[PDB]
Give the backbone structure.
Amino acid sequence: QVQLQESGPGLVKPSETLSLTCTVSGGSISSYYWSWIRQPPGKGLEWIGYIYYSGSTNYNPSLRSRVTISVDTSKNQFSLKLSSVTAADTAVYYCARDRGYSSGWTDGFDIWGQGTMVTVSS
Amino acid sequence: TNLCPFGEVFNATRFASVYAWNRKRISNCVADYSVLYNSASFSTFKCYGVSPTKLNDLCFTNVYADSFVIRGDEVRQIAPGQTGKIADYNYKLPDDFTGCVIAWNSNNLDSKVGGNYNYLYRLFRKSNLKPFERDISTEIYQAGSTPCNGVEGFNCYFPLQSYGFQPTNGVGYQPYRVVVLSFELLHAPATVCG
Amino acid sequence: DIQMTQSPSSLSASVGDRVTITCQASQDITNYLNWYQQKPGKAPKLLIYDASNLETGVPSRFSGSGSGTDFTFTISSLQPEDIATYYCQQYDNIPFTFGLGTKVD
Ligand SMILES: *[C@@H]1O[C@H](CO)[C@@H](O)[C@H](O)[C@H]1NC(C)=O
């Protein structure tokens, strides 16, 4: 039982940056690989990147240039700062979680939690 | 006898990549280093403070445990006053380092048949590192005259690179889990004793 | 990257039926594929992990099989609540790739 709830701005301006924040309750960031994915309206899911609790991150090569994932264990939350926003990023974003069991590599996402909408236009 | 928690420090399922090495504090507990020294399952156990046998009789005020995963080749770099890509861009010990280093092979765990993709190391940095320095920002590296302007390109590089940990690789290219214990004495009552 | 391909772009049937979804890869993915479902207006769930195991809390009417570069996810007995878009996904190499979805009506 990991209650996961996103909270980010619902509208940004073109060419600036957006910053969503994922909050976890009943959840132990202490060992799971946490990741963000996005869904354009009527398209498939796009993975963005995953972040360990220490600071070990890893980003999608297509989006490697302009993303920034941060983890704050004390306030047990995530920041996803995407810069150089274009019209192509109009999409919902999800805050997934690894399932657990592994050694040195993540697993399938498990605990998506309700995804919030992000509109980027004028 | 409330023993120190070396368990989840050495026996954890996952270690962070070398460029964001874990730093876990150890204090206000009694540490039984003998079982570590007598474990006999450690590929490398090199000490630069006092001899490993004696330190069980020596007491400190803080024990930082910094953990990560590296290649077998770079294992030598983790030592006071060493030079190399790991010892200037990712993690380097001060010369007067007061503590010592454990490491063991883990190819059974941290490598993939297709090659592991999770562990990353900082390939380029515009300067060397201070002692016990931890840098995770990953702005694009400007290896040429032009400013990369926040986008990759000709002689612009992403400052992190992924080890291809494959199980059949040579011992030089195998994944080794590494722990570094720094024992520091500050002007405070020593709490980590034998 | 990696290319997932789901054979059924769309599908329909009646209650209590057995339906099969084929996910084919662009290269070798040993067992590193998971099956999610998504009902409209909801975050996707997890159904099958490592291409063979049914995840805890899921009714056993689902199943999965395959290896190499091809896998199948099958509903032995369809139900009225199984209306959803289904996605295979790999985690064997970066980036993680999600299938373009199979609508089930
Ligand atoms: C890790 O677990 C093994 C399994 O029992 C145990 O023998 C070993 O002592 C543990 N490591 C430490 C540092 O206690």
About this structure: Residues 34 and 49 of chain C are 4 Å apart (CA to CA). Chain C touches chain A through 21 residues (CB under 8 Å).
